[PDB]
Amino acid sequence: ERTWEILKEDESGSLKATIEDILFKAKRKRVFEHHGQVRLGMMRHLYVVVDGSRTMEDQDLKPNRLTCTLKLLEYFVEEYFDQNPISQIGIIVTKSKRAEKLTELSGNPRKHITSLKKAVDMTCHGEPSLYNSLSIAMQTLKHMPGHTSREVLIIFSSLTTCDPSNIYDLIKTLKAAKIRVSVIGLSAEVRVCTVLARETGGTYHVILDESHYKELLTHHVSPPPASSSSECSLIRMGFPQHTIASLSDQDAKPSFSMAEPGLTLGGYFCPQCRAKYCELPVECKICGLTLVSAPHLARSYHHLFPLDAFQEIPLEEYNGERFCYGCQGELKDQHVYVCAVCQNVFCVDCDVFVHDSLHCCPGCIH
Amino acid sequence: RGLNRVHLQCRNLQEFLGGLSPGVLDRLYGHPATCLAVFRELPSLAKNWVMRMLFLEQPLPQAAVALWVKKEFSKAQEESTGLLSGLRIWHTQLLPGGLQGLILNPIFRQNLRIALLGGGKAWSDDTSQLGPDKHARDVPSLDKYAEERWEVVLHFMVGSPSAAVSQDLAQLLSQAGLMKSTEPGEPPCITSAGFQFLLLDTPAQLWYFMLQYLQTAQSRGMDLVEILSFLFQLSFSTLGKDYSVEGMSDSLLNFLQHLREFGLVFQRKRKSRRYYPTRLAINLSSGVSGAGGTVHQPGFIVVETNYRLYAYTESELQIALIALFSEMLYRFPNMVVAQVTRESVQQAIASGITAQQIIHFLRTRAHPVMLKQTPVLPPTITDQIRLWELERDRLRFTEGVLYNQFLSQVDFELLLAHARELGVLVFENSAKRLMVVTPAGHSDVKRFWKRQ
Amino acid sequence: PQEAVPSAAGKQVDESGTKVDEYGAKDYRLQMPLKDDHTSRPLWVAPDGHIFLEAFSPVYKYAQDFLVAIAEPVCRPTHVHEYKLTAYSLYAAVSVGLQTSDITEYLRKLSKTGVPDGIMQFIKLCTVSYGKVKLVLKHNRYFVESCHPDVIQHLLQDPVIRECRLRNSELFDFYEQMDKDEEEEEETQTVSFEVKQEMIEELQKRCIHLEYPLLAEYDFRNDSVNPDINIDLKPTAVLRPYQEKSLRKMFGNGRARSGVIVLPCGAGKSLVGVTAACTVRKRCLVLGNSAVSVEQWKAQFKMWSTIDDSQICRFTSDAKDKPIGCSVAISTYSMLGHTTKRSWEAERVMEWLKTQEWGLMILDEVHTIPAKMFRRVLTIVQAHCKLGLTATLVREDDKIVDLNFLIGPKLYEANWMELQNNGYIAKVQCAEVWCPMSPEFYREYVAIKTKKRILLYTMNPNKFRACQFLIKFHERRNDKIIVFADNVFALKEYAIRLNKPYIYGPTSQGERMQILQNFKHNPKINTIFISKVGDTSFDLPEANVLIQISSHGGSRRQEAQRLGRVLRAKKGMVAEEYNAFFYSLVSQDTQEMAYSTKRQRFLVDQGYSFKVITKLAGMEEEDLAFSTKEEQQQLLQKVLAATDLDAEEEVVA
Ligand SMILES: [Zn+2]
Ligand SMILES: [Zn+2]
Question: d(Cα A6, Cα C418) in Å, to the nearest integer?
Fold first, then answer.
């Protein structure tokens, strides 16, 4: 007997029209987090584990957990490749006390997202089997090279899981295998997953809101840190140049990529096996030599030397120009950002866009 | 009612100038601003090619120019080509050996060039070194004044009190066919075209209203080219800056007085030689207000799926317009509530208003909260609004001459062949040997029927 | 005097001579004084009781709850909502414990305009006396109670009321169970006295006349004298949140708060009623308009309650009845509200029923019962608690006097949006196939001024071909679909040519059940044809799509009632545009178009999504009947050769 009277004017005079001013911070956000100059698992094999159990039908979020999960998964899949084309993805669904590898080890969002679209039709059935899921995953990761960061991300919806044997078998194996596992839980903290994640070197987090769900996923987009226990390798890599059918396709037959059915007349050949690949980067399914484009390498070098947060202040007390450096414009906002090194004037968009998207400060390049 | 309902033929710049004489257009192209107005109105197809060709005096071959656009878009490029040539912008010149080279009218070329870079005149603009004017007028005061003036003209069509206008302007409203002369003394009355105009948006309204003024301009002895060039210079003017009436012909002075009375320009006094152009004049161009609430001023009609209209408007004019096609339910100080219904929309339809006018009228005035969605008007409303006219716009009338019951099929096939020969065939029935021909062929075919 | 006639029937505040402007709108700019905070105040309080809300306002959440708790909902489109104040809506707010000051203050605070004095007067008239006092019935003791002694002191000054009070006290309890001794806790805000058993009937008139209607509440739990039948819900019964709140609204205080509950067609209405009966655990009387409801309740009780065939008994002249050892009498109003005995079976049952004291009365169709029948029934049974179940708050028999006050305030209202947002009721695609009239049928349509015209709009090939396609489409989707029509020959000719099941009155129960079972459970029969009998209780099965072969028809509400009665959410399809569909087929330029228009309007008024159809893919791209002029002619001649009787409206029974 309180909801029709729950407005701010229920027991106040000024709240009759200042109610949305008193409760004005109702829907906003402001994303930022820390960083560190530590080794990163730039070569990344991340596998996604998603509950396929009846509990995924619950409406803890706006739509059922399944729809909200798949919605954010697609977005996460996109940015994961976008921020690391070198890495690869795979998906496993934990249904009927069993686990089904929705997607194999690959780096093609086309196939991965296509699988998601189709996976929207899945049937939430039975209880989850964390042991079966980790079995299929580890069985696959066993064959992956030690230097490639073998990681798994788990999305847990239920609280009870059917394991055919104590998961300590897998955790002891995973720890010895140096594989890393992280888990994202829905509405609750489970000891099983917490111990599993903390012991395995990953982290257990719980979803609060779709924004929090993105906030957590955002952290998993950045490559994990690496220790000296992982193989510090000197992996062989190919940088094949694109080659069209320039000579009227002469002595250059069109061919389908190892992964694709599209017969491409021009593209990237394998310097190791001369295979035809329409896209790059692509792993040589018939050689083991990975082929990567020179710009994709530089695309990740920001993680090696990222920017630092700029000095924030409510006013340009330093009395720089009335026009914000970088992007020209008036200091219309009573909050200013100043680079520690170059000390130029930066605005809200500069601190956000330059540090989170440009990753380079103009005055530091000078 | 031998033909369909009278429609307000909205003729953009192309349709209007497309009928003018080349010398008139050449005189018009005399000013740099007139060229820019024409140029900016061109489709992006023409817009780029003209800019690309502006710096050449060599007749580039028709084929090479046409081969600048991809195979599939070359067909759409023909539209811009037909326009540029039809608008005298493109004139063919012959390369050695008679090849079809293309050249832009040098006057237009030179004025666009003088528009982009210095020329003998500095855009025909100057400050006259005068200081800040007496009784300074502010930009918002200019807008409101222009708005008030425009509202007064719309109010005059609505026939509301205090709508003060000159009889020559009231006459023009009747002369243009907007205010019907159904009664002596010209009491407030409106034609289908006038209602369509009332529901039309401000820029297209002002544009077509001024086109009617121009259609009567030489009947009124005013200078078409001069007024047009002046109007284009005004469209390229600035709100806050001052402009002078120094060196303006009496024809321009008469028009300027109308232009002032019309609220497109603000003057210190009717006799003053310095003025400030209003937002309406700068925005006076053949363009579109938008698919939702107007960019310049937001909409106020909250159209709802239950056909309920919640117009956050105080304006008796806007309210009275809504009453034309919708049945009004309540009047509240800050907002008005009405509902669209078959009867009220059939009133608009019977008054000769295409449902698209209502749809667009509501769209252009759709409250900003209704935005942020692809369809601003729910499909059910859009469909039923159209369905109401499609219910009662199935009967289509057409005046013609019928040829029937000939002596044989040879007569029918001969008359049909003659109708086909002259292209005067409207419709025919080959089973009963019936043919309908345009009325122009009435005498020709009636007399031929005696000869065949 | 028990209906609280003045605010309900007199409606003092309804304007006359309204200042309607030239545009036809009510000019309330002067009546509703302008007030500031046009952007922060989300309400408009029109002097005619209508209220408007902004769904985009920042306080919409609270303002919606506020209007939902105070005013009847009218329309709830995406950006604006409409609500209407009524005595019953206001009394429901008062019974919840809301004060006239709080209501007036929050209204004035949320209204963009000052509240009109006429509405403020209506608020006073409907809040000061409307429910300040309660009539408790615990331990068979009629205790009159009010939160404020001020109200009862005034009431107690009435000499007739004083003659009703009984001097009695209530005891405590022993250490075996001294909670009844600890029930002396919270005697603050609590003052009550017993009234003589027989004075209640007269005292009610006196209190309502005195402007102090009694909120009657039956303490079924502590009532020791009326024996319990150990009634309990089967584990199959799971309460949905709206059902749980509806029961919470009723049993929130602990006693059965008598009143009317409104649940839209398709809700687990029976589950709420069975739960209420299972909660009361006392003998219950149930009333419906047909023996069908009686056995429909009985079957639903069997599936959700422990009550046996020795305990559920039917009592309706259509069937044999069993007073001996009955525990739940389920019965028809027209039997009980008789003017004179129907039979010796009325001597058997009505004298017996007049003698029993049912602990709870459940009305399944109170929104359809006339004042006289309801007044007779209420006078005869004299049940300790009454619960009114309704499909819609506005009753076709409401007319001048809102009989709802006889039962009490509205207890709960399940919002269409909450049911759709939670899938309890599917989103129904309302659509009308406006078929162009055929030239030949147009000859006969204008020439046949008599009602034989009905077949012409019904048998148009365009209507048949579209019907055939959509049926085959819904069959391809495997949607359960039912086809209804106003005429024998039409429905026969359709179902026969379509080679689909058709049900009529002569259809024997086994022949009927063969179809029903093969439709309800066998996935083969996707489409079935049902006669005009479907307009009423004919044990219609469950379906996901419904098509009206004729948009000609009766009451819009009865059509809407039928639509919800049959339509059910298609399992697993709730993500689609719609998971329920309704169609009504219309002949352009015919008498069907008005009922079509009025249905279209009434649907959008009720908030249902609507569309119009003329042609869709397959309507010509597929093999459909009457594709040739001759077959169209044969159909039209068979229609013309059919008598007026075969063309007239099919009987509903
Ligand atoms: Zn290779
Ligand atoms: Zn810097």
Answer: 20
Residue A356 per-residue DSSP state: I
**How many other C-beta atoms can be found within 10 angstroms of the C-beta atom of residue C87?**
25
Inter-residue contact C282 to C140 (CB < 8 Å): no
Q: Tell me the C-alpha distance between B246 and A74, whole Å.
A: 67
CA of A295 from ligand 2 middle (Å) equals 24
Give the number of residues written for chain C.
653
Neighbour count for residue B125 (Cβ, 10 Å): 14
Q: Tokens representing B441? A: 């062929």
Nearest to A221 by CA among A50, A42, A353: A42
Select the residue of C40, C65, C106 nearest A20 (Cβ to Cβ).
Answer: C40
* Dihedrals phi, psi of B165, to nearest 5 degrees: -145, 160
d(CA C53, CA C43): 5
Say if B369 is an interface residue toward chain C (CB within 8 Å).
yes
The DSSP result for C480-548, as a single string, is: -EEEE-S-HHHHHHHHHHHT--EE-TTS-HHHHHHHHHHHHT-TT--EEEE-GGGGS-S----BSEEEE
Distance A337 CA to ligand 2 centre (A): 10
- Which residues keep their CB under 5 angstroms from ion ligand 2? A 339, 341-342, 361, 363-364
- The type of residue at C140 is N
CA distance B116 to B120: 13
Residue whose C-alpha is closest to residue C590's, from C432, C456, C486, C463: C456
What is the Å distance from ligand 1's center to A271 Cα? 7
- What does the alpha-carbon distance between residue B145 and residue A250 come to, in Å, rounded to a whole number? 74
- DSSP three-state, residue B140: helix
**Residue C545 near residue C481, CB atoms below 8 Å:** yes
Measured distance CA(B179)–CA(B191) in Å, rounded: 6
Question: Which residue(s) pair with C435 in the sheet?
Answer: C587
Buried b (16+ CB within 10 A) or exposed e, C266-296: bbbbbbbbbbbbbbbbbbbbbbbbbbbbbbb
Q: How far apart are CA B177 and CA B452, in angstroms?
A: 44
Question: Per residue in C16-29, is it b (16+ CB within 10 Å) or e — as a string?
Answer: eeeeeeebebbbbb
Verify C-A touch: 3 or more CB pairs within 8 A.
yes
Query: Which residue among B308, B331, B333 places its CB closest to the CB of C25?
Result: B331
Residue corresponding to tokens 């106040």: A12
Q: Which residue has the tokens 């000197």?
A: A234
Experimental method: cryo-EM
| Contact between chains at C44 and B332 (C-beta distance less than 8 A) | yes
Q: Record the tokens describing residue B346, joined without a space.
A: 């059939």
Q: How many CA atoms lie within 13 A of A352 on its CB side?
A: 7
For residue B180, give both structure tokens: 């019907």
Rounded CA-CA distance C366/C320 in Å is 24
Hey, are the CB atoms on C97 and A1 less than 8 Å from each other?
Answer: yes
Resolution in A for the shown PDB structure? 4.1
What order do you get walking across the sheet with C191-195 strand by strand? C165-166, C191-195, C141-146, C133-138, C214-218, C256-257
Whole-number Å distance between alpha carbons of A236 and A319: 53
Inter-CA distances, B310 with B313, B337, C519, Å: 9, 5, 47
Neighbours of chain C (3+ CB pairs under 8 A): A, B
Judged on CB neighbours under 10 Å (0-12, 13-18, 19+), B381 is buried
Q: Which residues pair with C528 in a beta bridge?
A: C482
CA C536 to CA C653: how far, in whole Å?
Answer: 7
CA distance A158 to A186: 8
Instruction: Look at A7 and C68 and tell me if their CB atoms are within 8 Å.
Output: no
